[PDB]
Amino acid sequence: MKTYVPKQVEPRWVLIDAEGKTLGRLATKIATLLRGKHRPDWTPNVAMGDFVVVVNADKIRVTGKKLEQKIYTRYSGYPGGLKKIPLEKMLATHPERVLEHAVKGMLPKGPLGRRLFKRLKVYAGPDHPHQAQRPEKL
């Protein structure tokens, strides 16, 4: 008796509102979905996941003083090439990217983790591309 493993599956989509949801707390689940650790056939080496579409991402909200105090850093390659960007600045310039970031860091590392991140499509404000099913999830 070997353990069951999926054959090629159907890539289910999912829709999320994010307006008012917190951040990392929204991120946690978006990760789980991305992996598909909610599916009972879950396989570590394959990624049968859900595609995730998230909207109203300009509207994520967060607690404490993070809007000012929380900094994203970017080292270029160069002397003094470390860039420091506050939350407010990000949201104002590229809204989302903060959720994209929070989720990315929560996905695993390596070839496959990088693939799952492609399956998370994040937009600012309402709507999005209407192709797939995208059952709204709350």
Partner: protein, 205 residues
């Protein structure tokens, strides 16, 4: 934000008001706009331009008689004036009046593989006393075990020249609609006969 293509012709001096005024005459010929860009179809705003009418047909198959003013299609079309939306077709040197300040993009003479010291105006080695084959050389490039490597911008010798260069705030000394000339003072990049694009200044705009 007015702009027009041209070719560096040569330099001379002008004697204006008992002063010398060295000048670089660039010829900016009539410039047959062959396309426009719109925040609708494009997402920004500019004009394609086109210059130097020649070829009978080397133009082959992809082309525009779409804007059709490309009649006598031009060798170099070099295009964006960025946010410029001119009067009708065909911008001329009428565009500029004398005493106007202008920025000029052009292609700097290629020096090919050029030492540090002429690339970077390094000091080089002494020509005597100890000497030993480092006269023209760069020196140390780094420290020791830390960082144990070379910084990512580190000035060294490589191809130098033959690049984009825009010398800014040049004064328009004269413009001669007759032959499509234009006279600015000084710095403008690159060889006689090379292409230059000529824009209004960014001191004010």
């Amino acid at each position: 934000m007015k702009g027009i293509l041209g070719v560096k012709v040569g330099m001379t001096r002008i004697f204006r008001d008992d002063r010398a005024v060295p000048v670089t005459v660039i010829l900016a010929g009539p410039c047959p706009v062959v396309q426009r860009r719109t925040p609708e179809k494009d997402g920004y705003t500019a004009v394609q331009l086109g210059f130097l009418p020649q070829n009978p047909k080397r133009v082959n198959r992809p082309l525009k008689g779409h804007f059709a003013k490309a009649g006598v299609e031009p060798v170099r079309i070099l295009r964006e004036i960025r946010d410029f939306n001119p009067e009708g077709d065909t911008v001329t040197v009428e565009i500029f009046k004398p005493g106007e300040r202008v920025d000029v993009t052009g292609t700097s003479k290629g020096r090919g593989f050029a030492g540090v010291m002429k690339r970077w105006n390094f000091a080089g080695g002494p020509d005597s006393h100890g000497a030993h084959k480092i006269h023209r050389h760069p020196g140390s490039i780094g420290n020791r075990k830390t960082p144990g490597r070379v910084y990512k911008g580190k000035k060294m010798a490589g191809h130098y020249g033959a690049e984009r260069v825009t010398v800014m705030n040049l004064e328009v000394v004269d413009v001669i609609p007759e032959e499509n000339l234009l006279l600015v003072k000084g710095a403008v990049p690159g060889p006689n006969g090379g292409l230059v694009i000529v824009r209004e200044t960014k001191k004010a705009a």
